[PDB]
Each structure stands twice: as C-alpha cells, then as structure tokens.
Amino acid sequence: SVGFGLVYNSVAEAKKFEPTYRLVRYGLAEKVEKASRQQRKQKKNRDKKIFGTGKRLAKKVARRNAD
Amino acid sequence: GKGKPRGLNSARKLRVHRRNNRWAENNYKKRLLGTAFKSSPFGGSSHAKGIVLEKLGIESKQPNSAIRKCVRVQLIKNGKKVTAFVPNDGCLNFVDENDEVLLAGFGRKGKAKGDIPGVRFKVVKVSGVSLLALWKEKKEKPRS
Amino acid sequence: PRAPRTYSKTYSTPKRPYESSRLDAELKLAGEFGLKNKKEIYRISFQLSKIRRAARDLLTRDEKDPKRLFEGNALIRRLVRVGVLSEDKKKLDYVLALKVEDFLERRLQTQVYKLGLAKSVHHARVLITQRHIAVGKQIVNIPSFMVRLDSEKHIDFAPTSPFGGARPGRVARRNAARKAEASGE
Amino acid sequence: AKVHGSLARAGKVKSQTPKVEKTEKPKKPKGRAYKRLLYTRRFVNVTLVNGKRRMNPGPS
RNA sequence: GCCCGUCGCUAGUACCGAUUGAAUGGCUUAGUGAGGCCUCAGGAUCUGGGA
RNA sequence: GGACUUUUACUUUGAAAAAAUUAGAGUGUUCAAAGCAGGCGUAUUGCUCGAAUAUAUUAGCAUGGAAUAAUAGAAUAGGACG
RNA sequence: GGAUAGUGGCCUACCAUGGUUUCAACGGGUAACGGGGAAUAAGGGUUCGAUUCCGGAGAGGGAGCCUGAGAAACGGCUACCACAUCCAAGGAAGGCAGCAGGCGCGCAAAUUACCCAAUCCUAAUUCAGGGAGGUAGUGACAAUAAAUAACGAUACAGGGCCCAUUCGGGUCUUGUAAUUGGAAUGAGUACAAUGUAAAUACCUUAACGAGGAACAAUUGGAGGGCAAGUCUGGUGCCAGCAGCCGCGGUAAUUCCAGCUCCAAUAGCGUAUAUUAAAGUUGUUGCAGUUAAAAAGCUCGUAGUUGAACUUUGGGCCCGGUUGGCCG
Ligand SMILES: [Mg+2]
Ligand SMILES: [Mg+2]
Ligand SMILES: [Mg+2]
Ligand SMILES: [Mg+2]
Ligand SMILES: [Mg+2]
Ligand SMILES: [Mg+2]
Ligand SMILES: [Mg+2]
Ligand SMILES: [Mg+2]
Ligand SMILES: [Mg+2]
Ligand SMILES: [Mg+2]
Ligand SMILES: [Mg+2]
Ligand SMILES: [Mg+2]
Ligand SMILES: [Mg+2]
Ligand SMILES: [Mg+2]
Ligand SMILES: [Mg+2]
Ligand SMILES: [Mg+2]
Ligand SMILES: [Mg+2]
Ligand SMILES: [Mg+2]
Ligand SMILES: [Mg+2]
Ligand SMILES: [Mg+2]
Ligand SMILES: [Mg+2]
Ligand SMILES: [Mg+2]
Ligand SMILES: [Mg+2]
Ligand SMILES: [Mg+2]
Ligand SMILES: [Mg+2]
Ligand SMILES: [Mg+2]
Ligand SMILES: [Mg+2]
Ligand SMILES: [Mg+2]
Ligand SMILES: [Mg+2]
Ligand SMILES: [Mg+2]
Ligand SMILES: [Mg+2]
Ligand SMILES: [Mg+2]
Ligand SMILES: [Mg+2]
Ligand SMILES: [Mg+2]
Ligand SMILES: [Mg+2]
Ligand SMILES: [Mg+2]
Ligand SMILES: [Mg+2]
Ligand SMILES: [Mg+2]
Ligand SMILES: [Mg+2]
C-alpha cells in the first residue's frame, strides 16, 4: 500500500494545521454535527423575512389574536 | 484544353461554375432546397409516431400476386396521412384502429420497397411495445 | 466545465466483410495464440497499421533529417524493446515490413506458454486471468500484457496462489475438509 | 392498384405450421473456447475432402 | 412478335381555381400614446437664498 | 542628421503567436483508453530526470532571392546628368 | 455646435451632391451564433460544429432607467404587451435559457439526494457563503481492458512409423467419446482494514461461493451480391420473404419451423443523415458525332488569356556540410 504521512512538531501544531475531518478520524476533535445543509439554508431564508430582532413581531402578532 | 478555364486567375469562374453545376446533384439540391423539412411526411427525422386510421389490404405489384397488409396512419406532429406496411406473418392482428404506432422508413431513401405500391414506411411499434417482440411472443400488448 | 477526458478506439474492422481467405487466415491466428475475438486480431492490425504509416512517412524525408532521425530512432528502440523487431533488422525499412504474428508472439499469454509453464495457449489464458503468474512481485492478469524483453526472465508464478507456494486453495482445502471430517473426528 | 383486399388470412401459415419444441442439446462453450473448437474443426483434425471441402453437408 | 393514343376502374401526388379566401412571422405609414429621464414651474414641511 | 526614392505578384527564412484536440518524445496507469507523472537512496529527518518537439497556411509584420508575369520610362523633348 | 468617457452624421443647424454595384451591390433564404475544432484516412477533397475552451448575445416580448468603477442588469426597479397566482373583491404579488423537479412538445435526453474535503471565487475576510464546483443516484451516448472454462486417465477408432511371412495394436499424440478423475478461479455473498467530508464502489483480503437443473450469449443470416444446406416437416402466387436481382401457383436451396451450419460477439439488427466507394461535380480529374450535352449564325462589353528580344559569358579569391581513404 502506498500513502502519505505528516508528523507535527507538537500536538498543539497538528490540532491547528490539520483539516478538521482528519482530527475527527483520530479522536482529537468532536464531530459537532448540525442541521441538514438545506435545513440551514431554509432557516436562513425564513430569517430574511424578518427585519430587526423579531420579538417586536411576536407581540404585535399576539394582538391579532383578538381581531 | 476543351472547355474549362485553365488560367491562374480563373478561380472565381471555376467556383461559380461548380456551384452552378452542383444543382444537378439529386442529393445536394434536396439538401439545400430543404426538401426533407418541407415535403416528406416525417420532419426529416428518422421515425415518426402516428395513429392508425384504417387497415388496408394493398394488392402487390407484378409479377407478384399477394395482399400486402398495411395501415393508414395519421402522423401526430403533422396530421399528414401515410400508409405503412406491417412486416411479418400475422402482425396485422397486432394492430387495431386508433392504435398508436411508430413508423420508420424502408431504407431506400424515400422510394417504395419492393412489390408494394405507394408504401414508403413500415411499422416498428404499437402501443409502446414493438412488433418483433409481440411476434416472437416475448411481450404482450398493453391493456388499453 | 472540466477538461475533456480524451479517448480513442484501439481497433479497425475489415472493409470486406466476408472474404474467405482472410477469415481462415484470422481463425488460424486465433487458434494459435488463444485469442477469443476477431477483434484481438483487428486490434493488432490497427496498431501495425499506424506504425507502418509513421514509417512510410519518415522514409519520405531525406536521410538523416532531424525528425526522421529522432522519431525513427525512437520507434525502432520502442519495437526492439518488446522483442518485435530483431537486432539485425534495426533500421525501419524492416519495421516497414513487420508482420502481425511478430506482435502476437510477444503477448504475456504466449510467453507464459513458450517456456512451458502452461503447455497450451489456453491453459496460458486461464492461468493469467486467475491471478497466478507475475512479473515482479507484481501480479498480471491481462493476456495482452506484451512481454518486454527484459521481463521475459521474470515471467514466473506469483508468490500467492498454488503453483507458487503460498497455499493450496479453497477448492482443494474443501476436499481436505472432507478427508479429516469423514475419516477422523 | 386495389387497396381493400381481404384481411381474413393474416397469419395464416404461422398459425397452421405445427409446433415442434426445441430439442435439449449439449451447451456450446462461449468465448475463446468456441474459436478453439472452430479451429480444430476447420484446420487441425480436419474432416472430409470429397474433391474440396464442406461445412454443412447432410446426406453426402 | 413488338407496339401508340382516346375511352373505362382503383389509389396516390402536385398544379389551376370563385372565396379580393385563411394563418404565422419580420419590418412599417398615419393616428392615439404608458413610463422613466432631462427641463419651465410648484411648495405639504423645514431650515439657513438653500433643501 | 539631411536631401529623394516607379509600382506589384511569386518564393525564401523569421518574428508574433492559448490551452485542450491532432502528430509525436519520455514514463511499465498490472495491460490498455488514459494521466503527466515519476525515478533513485542512508526508505531515521533526502536525492533526483521531467512536464519535450512538430503542425499552426489566408491576411498583416520582418529578411533573403531577382527566374517567371505584370507596372512605369525620352518622341510636338515640358528628356537626362553639371 | 451640441451631446459623449472620448473619435465619428452620433445628433442638430447651414451648405454641397455625393456613397455602393457583374471583381454581384441591394434584396431574399438560412431547419446560421462565430472560432478552437469533429467525422471521413492515397492525395486533392466532402460534410459537420446547439454542446467541456475563447468571443458574442439573451433572460417570456419590447422600451426605459436607478445604483454604481463597471449594467441599458432582469435570481434590480418602472411602463406597456402576452402569460399568470393569491383575496375577505378593497387589493396584493410572479419571470428556472441556475440546480433539481413538473407539464407540454415530440423519435429524442437522468435525482425534487450528500458536501464545501478538493478546485477555486467573493466578503470587513485563515473562520462565513458558494446547486460555482465536487460526491453519489439514474445512465449499453461514445471509449478501454476482456469471464462464460483449463488439464489429466480410460473405452474402443485413426492416421503415423519400424516389421508385415499376414494376426496387429503400442508409443510419439490427431482428436470423436452418454461411465470417470482430482485441480483453478471470480460473478456474487461478506469479518476487517483501506477508500471517502460521511457514505458507495474500486484496489486489498478472513469465512463462503461450479459440474450441465448451470453461475446455462447474444443478434442476424445460410439462392446471388455474401461467409453458411438443394436436410426434414408445413403452406400451395395464400400466408409471407425480398435494400437490389428475385422467391412462393404441391417434390419452396428464399416463406413458417425443426435440425445443422456461417458472421460479428457483450454485444448484434433496423430507420434517418453524412463520409469513403464517386474520375457519378472532375483544381488534381469527367463527359458532350451516334449513349444526357456545342447557342441557327456572326459582331461584341465585362471576364479569362495573350509571340520574341534588354548582364550573358569568362577570371580570381573566402569560409562552410556531408562522404571517402587514411587516425
Ligand atoms: Mg449553509
Ligand atoms: Mg441577518
Ligand atoms: Mg436540368
Ligand atoms: Mg423487375
Ligand atoms: Mg386510403
Ligand atoms: Mg512561414
Ligand atoms: Mg503544445
Ligand atoms: Mg460634420
Ligand atoms: Mg442626390
Ligand atoms: Mg452571382
Ligand atoms: Mg438560429
Ligand atoms: Mg456553421
Ligand atoms: Mg460553437
Ligand atoms: Mg438551434
Ligand atoms: Mg446581458
Ligand atoms: Mg421559457
Ligand atoms: Mg417591434
Ligand atoms: Mg433588462
Ligand atoms: Mg444574473
Ligand atoms: Mg376587507
Ligand atoms: Mg431548472
Ligand atoms: Mg431564474
Ligand atoms: Mg438516449
Ligand atoms: Mg466555506
Ligand atoms: Mg474570531
Ligand atoms: Mg450541486
Ligand atoms: Mg453467462
Ligand atoms: Mg456449471
Ligand atoms: Mg439463432
Ligand atoms: Mg457462398
Ligand atoms: Mg414437402
Ligand atoms: Mg422445404
Ligand atoms: Mg430455413
Ligand atoms: Mg458491424
Ligand atoms: Mg492542380
Ligand atoms: Mg460521367
Ligand atoms: Mg444525343
Ligand atoms: Mg453547331
Ligand atoms: Mg511573354
């Protein structure tokens, strides 16, 4: 088998110059998994419908629950 | 020299003269006049799909005596009407009026096949299946 | 938007479809070198065909023209390299000669048979495609491998497989599993 | 020509030739082995040379 | 022996043809003319003549 | 630096010139279509060959040729040199 | 002069009468985006290029324009035209020739999946974003490699060959065999490691995985062109075949089948187009008395073409590149 190798001068240096998927393979970093790539996109686009923080819009839309 | 120019500057005359005379080429003239696209029941395309109007029994040319089973088909993209042959023994039993069929040429560059007068096309499929398969009985005609 | 993967085909087919002499001529070759295809002959004809074309061309250039000298030399050394072109006839007017059989003679298929080691061109096929016979420690399973002169000494069974030590093999071992399970405990 | 000839008889013969089933036979080798068998047939052992040669003779 | 044309049958193609016939597409007269831009004004309001 | 130059074709050599494709060199992708890699050691602290060349024409540019084929010249001398 | 970033009839004012054309203007057609290129291999050519790269143009159709260095921008706005969605009928909103997906059209073309790990692009920026792009799925578009078997023993049969007065078989194998013999291997299934962003496949490789009931090759053809039957059964100018020539009306070498045989083979047939064959478009290189073809005749402009002659001969030097015989 032929491959490729790297040896860092320190473990501080690997953990900072290594691609993060690689650190994952080894056990030096946690796979911080997240929403689907397109679940994320959809959250971005919903969020674009709002201008400002939002909570202003929660209360105003709470008034609607009277009309 | 009989009859062409030979001069070193007679290039134009020599091209024009050629252009003029290419129109005697049967293939060339059809290509440029666009005969395909203009007349001719298919678009100029390899096959065409149509609808079966009636089943004909075309009587064969001499010295041959036979009834050559055929179909009048109305081309879908066209409404152009066409009669086509239904190759092999039986196979007319595989079609039916208002059936969809897939016509192809007869390999003769337009032009009728053998002893069948008028006919320039043959059937290749019916209701999405293909005679051949139906004939050799490896497939069955669809529901409706 | 990515560079084309380039390709090209590696054979040519006879213009005359049904020439009885060419057909017998082709079959004989197939039955001599263990081929399965008329294509395995079609292929080589095509290889030859260009090689000759190159050579025809080069020949028209003046003797000792740079391209001729350079590109002719190259082609000759490439042919001598694999044992198609004899040492004596090393000057391209004979690469202009050069037959199909000269090429078929150098396939790993045949070489594997020429020094015993198989005793039938077909045993030679089956062995090759079945992961026995190697060149280095490097196993070769292609019958058309084309044995370069200086590897001819190195055609031999592989360290793996039977025939080359390693282990007998699941079809035999399966029997030795009926030897010790019927006659013993 | 006439264009409304009978149609009754479509498939006449195929429907009235009597079926006979294909007969179970040895399997022929495929691939290289088949060219091999062709070679020994045509050239190695040979068969007949009644004048010249034949490939599909019957009652010769 | 070969063979010509009218006349009669079936089927196919293209021509002519009242309908001042029909359809699509590209330009286009004349008339009407949205809109933004530029410009003469205007001045809700809002400042130090200007916005 | 000044002062003045009949006008063309043809041919040569060369510059300017994208890559990919094509032709083609080198290299054993296991073979091959490909790819532009790869190959040597102290395989424990590194050594090293590459990634060529050809074609690229009509036109424009630049140089050499002066055959072939054109153009212009002095005859109301308003000719040529000083 | 105005306008432009700026030249310019670009526009305006004054003035003039010019500009292009048989060396084909102008107009029409194009089922026309241009190029690098593709197909076809004596050469000369013929045909094709929507399409991985360069250039141009467009975002349903037209026009207008805001921002901005840059747009006459459409995943920006404005208007009109055409489509078209929501409604409480008051109104409001949309532009897939991006990715995927649907309808329609048709002979004709795939997943509403995964990722920024590579390649690179952008931003205030190592970090965020990227349906650019990469990954897999669909996929016999094209292209490459090439499994469907290999070896012995036996049973007669041979041709060899030494002998043959005459049995014959006995060794060197030619091989057709209805009992046989053990070996081999991946197609697949699958620990594991490898692969990968994570998966999948490949490359590795434990355990499994071949005797005919497979793990069982096809597609066309067998009168000629054209490689392969005058076998057998069926039909009886019917059914059907046949690119073309031709077969079929009762012993069909051609149809429908069985048998056997041929060709190419993980591929082979058919249709349409084009190229070669085609010296049947002819520059190379055609033909024109009678086969298709010299205008009834002469003049003649454009066009093509157009006799010979003008520094040749002789002398001297210089330095190159092959090749000989010597080295
Ligand atoms: Mg995201
Ligand atoms: Mg935000
Ligand atoms: Mg005519
Ligand atoms: Mg006839
Ligand atoms: Mg009819
Ligand atoms: Mg040049
Ligand atoms: Mg290059
Ligand atoms: Mg002016
Ligand atoms: Mg005028
Ligand atoms: Mg003209
Ligand atoms: Mg167009
Ligand atoms: Mg074009
Ligand atoms: Mg293009
Ligand atoms: Mg188009
Ligand atoms: Mg644009
Ligand atoms: Mg659209
Ligand atoms: Mg308009
Ligand atoms: Mg726009
Ligand atoms: Mg855009
Ligand atoms: Mg309301
Ligand atoms: Mg889309
Ligand atoms: Mg869009
Ligand atoms: Mg398709
Ligand atoms: Mg990112
Ligand atoms: Mg930070
Ligand atoms: Mg994507
Ligand atoms: Mg199989
Ligand atoms: Mg089996
Ligand atoms: Mg068959
Ligand atoms: Mg024959
Ligand atoms: Mg009979
Ligand atoms: Mg018969
Ligand atoms: Mg038959
Ligand atoms: Mg073929
Ligand atoms: Mg010439
Ligand atoms: Mg002729
Ligand atoms: Mg005549
Ligand atoms: Mg005359
Ligand atoms: Mg002259």
Widest CA span in chain B: 74
Instruction: Tell me whether strands B100-105 and B81-85 are parallel, antiparallel or unpaired.
Output: unpaired
For residue C139, the 8-state DSSP code is B
On strand G, nucleotides with any atom < 7 Å from a protein CB are: 23, 31, 41, 47-48, 52-53, 105-108, 113-118, 129-134, 142-152, 174-176, 182-186, 194-198, 204-205, 207-210, 212-214, 216-217, 220, 222, 226-231, 233-235, 237-249, 255-266, 270-275, 281-284, 286-288, 294, 303-306, 322-323
Give the separation between CA B119 and CA B33, rounded to whole angstroms.
24
**Host H or E run for residue B124:** strand B121-126
Match 């035999």 to its residue by tokens. C172
Contact C127, C120 (CB under 8 A): no
Contact B50, B73 (CB under 8 A): yes
Give the separation between CA B109 and CA B122, rounded to whole angstroms.
13
Asked whether the CA dihedral C148, C149, C151, C152 is positive or negative, the reply is positive
CA C130 to chain centre: 16
Angle at C151 between CA C75 and CA C115, to 5 degrees: 115
Give the separation between CA B70 and CA B86, rounded to whole angstroms.
5
The Cα-based distances of C176 to B33, B142, C169, C171, C173 in angstroms read 81, 57, 10, 9, 5
Give the separation between CA B27 and CA B101, rounded to whole angstroms.
29
Any chains having at least 3 CB pairs less than 8 A from chain C are D
Structure tokens at C81: 């390299």
| Number of helical H runs and strand E runs in chain D | 2, 0
Contact C140, C148 (CB under 8 A): no
**Contact flag D39-C36 (C-beta cutoff 8 Å):** no
**Domain range for B129:** 1-144
Contact C125, C150 (CB under 8 A): no
Angle at C40 between CA C37 and CA C45, to 5 degrees: 135
Structure tokens at A48: 């674009």
Which of C62, C64, C71 minimizes the C-alpha distance to C95?
Answer: C71
Residue C60 phi/psi, 5-degree rounding, is -75, -25
* Chain D hits for C28, Cβ within 8 Å: 39, 43
Residue C57: what residue type? D
Q: DSSP letters of B28-92?
A: HHHHHHTHHHHSSSS-SSSEEEEEEEEEEEEEPPTT---EEEEEEEEETTT--EEEEE--SSS-T
Give the separation between CA C71 and CA B141, rounded to whole angstroms.
64
Residue B10 phi/psi, 5-degree rounding, is -90, 30
Contact B137, B130 (CB under 8 A): no
Give the separation between CA C84 and CA C99, rounded to whole angstroms.
9
CA nearest to D29 within chain C: C36
The Cα-based distances of D48 to C25, C177, D38, D52 in angstroms read 20, 51, 15, 8
**Contact flag C36-D35 (C-beta cutoff 8 Å):** yes
The radius of gyration of chain D's CA atoms, rounded to the nearest angstrom, is: 22
Structure obtained using? X-ray
CA dihedral in degrees (C69, C74, C75, C78; nearest 10)? 150
Write the Ramachandran bin of B125: left for phi over 0, alpha for psi from -120 to 50, otherwise beta.
beta
Which of C123, C93, C130, C95 minimizes the C-alpha distance to C109?
Answer: C123
Query: Can you give the length of chain A in residues?
Result: 67
Specify the number of domains making up chain B. Answer: 1
Asked whether residue B43's C-beta has any atom of DNA/RNA strand G within 7 A, the reply is yes
Asked whether residue C2's C-beta has any atom of DNA/RNA strand G within 7 A, the reply is yes
CA nearest to C40 within chain D: D32
Contact B85, B122 (CB under 8 A): yes
Contact C107, C144 (CB under 8 A): yes
The Cα-based distances of A48 to A54, A61, D26 in angstroms read 11, 18, 75
* Chain B hits for D12, Cβ within 8 Å: 89
Structure tokens at C87: 């040492």
Structure tokens at D33: 């082995």
Reduce the DSSP state of residue D35 to 3 states and report it: helix
Contact C47, C103 (CB under 8 A): yes
